[PDB]
Amino acid sequence: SVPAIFLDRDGTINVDHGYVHEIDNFEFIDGVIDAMRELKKMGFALVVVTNQSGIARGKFTEAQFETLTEWMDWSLADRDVDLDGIYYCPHHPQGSVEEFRQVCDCRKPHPGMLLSARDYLHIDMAASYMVGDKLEDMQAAVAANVGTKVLVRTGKPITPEAENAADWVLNSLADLPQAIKK
């Protein structure tokens, strides 16, 4: 079993402009790419787990999400960051788009995505981290029995509830490798 860093996307990896689905609006947060590269060096699997309800909302299609996700994957790989898994939930109970309109197991704070990754990559959850800027991230982690829950300040002005649920609060994903080294 391998330990992993589970990663929220908007507000953690890219700047959260809300319903981000275009390459020219995808902006990597400073230092996160180097941080992820170091996390790989330190022996962690990297797994993105991201809610994308904009799909259910009709803000953008699944096709558009794949295009952006593919681009993200290459950009990282080309910087010698090779993501071990990318999971997303396109659902929302009130989705305007029929295909995606539903309650589900995979929308954070449901731990579904993390459990799927766990089974797939044989991940050591207790030895793993979850990084995000929202409560739903911390709660998802709690349910999936992730060892360490890390909240970041690069997205949402953190709520006291999110803060409560978190084990650590870091300014950024960029700071995670040093925090773990220590």
Ligand SMILES: [Ca+2]
């Ligand atoms: Ca987020």
Ligand SMILES: [Zn+2]
């Ligand atoms: Zn879902």
